[PDB]
């Protein structure tokens, strides 16, 4: 299943990075790279992922 990502990034555009600044509870600049083969966002309740 995982190796099927080879088509992703070649036939289509896929998100790869998110940048934030003074958004929500994220004071100042913040960043998070997003992997080609899928990714997860984890953190305790009330952490800011949503």
């Amino acid at each position: 299943m995982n190796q099927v990502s080879g088509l992703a990034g070649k036939e289509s555009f896929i998100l790869t990075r998110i940048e934030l600044f003074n958004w929500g509870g994220f004071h100042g600049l913040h960043q998070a790279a997003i992997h080609q083969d899928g990714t997860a966002v984890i953190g305790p309740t009330g952490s800011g992922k949503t």
């Binding site: 299943m1 995982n2 099927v4 990502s5 088509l7 992703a8 036939e11 289509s12 555009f13 896929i14 998100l15 929500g24 509870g25 994220f26 004071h27 913040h30 960043q31 998070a32 790279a33 997003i34 992997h35 080609q36 083969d37 899928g38 990714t39 997860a40 966002v41 984890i42 953190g43 305790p44 309740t45 009330g46 952490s47 800011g48 992922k49 949503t50």
Partner: protein, 148 residues
């Protein structure tokens, strides 16, 4: 809706999901919505029909691959067992959509087998931050001169 069902093509046909049997090809369930169901059994209906319809909207007619290929799932698998969430991930793979899963530290071992990076988010006081983590497989050989 009276004039819609006359002049609007979208209203000229009614839709309904159907579960087919792999061997015989017969119908087991006709499901115009998601009423009933257990939850997880309801969430899989929702995710399947949403992903299938999401590739409809993101694809020009006849194209196999949508030009925009990312999908975001909040509270991923919040009310589904592992065996069911596996099939949601499989469906997302079949249509060819890069997936970003959110989860409050649940089903971690599931994401472990179907993702290659995580974004740990944490809060202290009135501030929050993020950290990037990743992993890959050294497929060259599990253990040379050994079973694999």
């Amino acid at each position: 809706l009276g004039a819609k069902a006359l002049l609007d093509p979208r209203f000229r046909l009614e839709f309904a999901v159907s579960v087919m049997d792999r061997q015989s090809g017969n119908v087991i369930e006709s499901r115009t919505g998601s009423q009933g169901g257990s939850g997880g059994e309801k969430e899989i209906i929702a995710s399947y029909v949403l992903t299938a319809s999401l590739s409809y909207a993101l694809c020009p007619a006849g194209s196999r691959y949508p030009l925009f290929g990312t999908i975001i799932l909040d509270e991923a698998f919040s009310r589904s067992s592992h065996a069911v969430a596996g099939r949601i991930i499989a469906a997302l793979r079949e249509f060819g959509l890069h997936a970003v899963f959110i989860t409050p530290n649940k089903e971690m071992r599931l994401l472990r087998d179907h993702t290659r990076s995580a974004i740990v988010v944490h809060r202290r006081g009135q501030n929050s931050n993020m950290a990037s983590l990743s992993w890959e497989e050294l497929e060259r050989h599990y253990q040379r001169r050994g079973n694999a």
